[PDB]
Design a protein around this ligand. Structure first.
Ligand SMILES: [Ca+2]
Ligand SMILES: [Ca+2]
Ligand SMILES: [Ca+2]
Ligand SMILES: [Ca+2]
Ligand SMILES: [Ca+2]
Ligand SMILES: [Ca+2]
Ligand SMILES: [K+]
Length: 405
């Protein structure tokens, strides 16, 4: 048979003895009316005179400066029967005098994106001077960590929450609370405010490009030294920026300024040959980690810089019958290295245009019954014309010899 009670040293006369340390619930003795008598301390504690369940009460106020631990014996009596004795033990627990209080009301602290989950943010420590458990401090983060931060219930260290990977330029206002492990009704707490901002690693970044890829058009005709493109990379921290081409131009046909980032042209372009460059460019602090990249797609565009050339080995000596019209003389063929309208060839005749004609393709014909005796030798000149505005020509004299039978 064994009872354990608890009473607070500030408790009034006429107070029930409790069962938990929490002091929320009262002590509960069974009466199996009957007479429960108690042997010691009868001047401070009294039993409930009636009821199946019975309570202990304060007669005189207690104080634990002397006498923190009463132990005595309930027994029930009835004349007929004296009971076996029940042991009651009580503890007079100390009042909560002190609020756990932080040194500072607020805290300012930085966080860097490179720091992982579990990496520590800020140790902070309230101090509750009350001896025992009226000063065992517990720390909770109430709100405003967005669950990216978590504190240690007992140590007071805020570290990074599981699997977060913090984004830059992100602020926070955590509100932490220190509370003592005292009983509920007599328990103190104080709150505190951690303002957090997220920086980049080492508070440093590379110089960034306003875009990752650049889609250019250039005319093969564009001058040497004429600027293609300014590569305006801003650096957050104000570091000086060094640009350089890294891939895509083994010829140094292009010149990117080391300091200004302007990309001029260094050698003459020809599209006939190579019609597209794709460089890689870089801007950087110097700081080993601090460096960005970017890809620039030069596509060179066409100008009519090429006359249509006749195929070298065309038969030049031709023959057509004595006397006929729409009679096939022979065929020519010309090509143009340019592109578009500048590539298209159109065939024309530079003389004898009432005698002979020519089709859209190379096919030369007679328009009229040619006369074997009036004429035998025609040095005729055929003209290939490219299809541009401001077109270019080539000519080719053929030697037609008209026949008979
Ligand atoms: Ca006290
Ligand atoms: Ca306290
Ligand atoms: Ca920088
Ligand atoms: Ca060219
Ligand atoms: Ca052309
Ligand atoms: Ca061209
Ligand atoms: K104290």
């Amino acid at each position: 048979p064994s009872y354990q009670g608890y009473i607070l040293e500030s408790a009034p006369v006429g107070a029930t003895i409790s069962e938990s340390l929490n002091l929320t619930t009262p002590l509960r003795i069974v009466a199996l009316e009957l007479h429960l008598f108690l042997n010691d301390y009868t001047s401070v504690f009294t039993v409930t005179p009636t009821g199946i369940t019975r309570y202990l009460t304060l007669l005189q106020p207690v104080d634990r400066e002397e006498q923190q631990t009463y132990t005595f014996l309930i027994t029930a009596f009835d004349g007929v029967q004296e009971s076996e004795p029940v042991v009651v033990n009580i503890r007079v627990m100390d009042a909560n005098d002190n609020t756990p209080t932080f040194p500072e009301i607020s805290y300012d602290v930085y966080v860097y994106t490179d720091m992982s989950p579990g990496d520590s943010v800020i140790q902070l420590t309230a101090v509750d001077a009350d001896e025992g458990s009226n000063g065992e401090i517990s720390y909770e983060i109430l709100v405003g960590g967005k669950g990216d931060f978590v504190i240690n219930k007992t140590t007071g260290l805020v570290s990074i929450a599981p699997g977060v990977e913090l984004i830059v330029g992100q602020t926070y206002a955590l509100t932490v609370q220190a509370s003592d492990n005292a009983p509920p009704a007599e328990r103190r707490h104080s709150i505190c405010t951690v303002y957090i901002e997220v920086l980049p690693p080492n508070n440093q970044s590379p110089p960034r490009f306003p875009q990752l890829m650049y889609s250019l058009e250039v005319s093969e005709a564009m001058r040497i030294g004429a600027i293609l493109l300014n590569l305006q990379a801003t650096d957050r921290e104000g570091d000086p920026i060094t640009y350089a081409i890294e891939n895509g131009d083994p010829q140094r046909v292009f010149n990117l300024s080391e300091t200004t980032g302007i990309l001029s042209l260094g050698k003459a372009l020809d599209r006939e040959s190579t019609d597209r460059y794709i460089l890689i460019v870089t801007a950087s602090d110097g700081r080993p980690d601090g460096t960005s990249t970017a890809t620039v797609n030069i596509v060179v565009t066409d100008v009519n810089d090429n006359a249509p050339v006749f195929d070298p080995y065309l038969p030049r000596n031709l023959s057509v019958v004595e006397e006929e019209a729409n009679a096939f003389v022979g065929q020519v063929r010309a090509t143009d290295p340019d592109a578009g309208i500048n590539g298209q060839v159109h065939y024309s005749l530079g003389n004898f245009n009432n005698l002979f004609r020519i089709t859209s393709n190379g096919s030369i014909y007679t328009a009229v019954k040619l006369n074997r005796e009036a004429r035998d030798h025609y040095e005729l000149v055929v003209v290939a014309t490219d299809g541009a505005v401001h077109p270019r020509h080539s000519t080719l004299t053929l030697y037609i010899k008209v026949l008979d039978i």
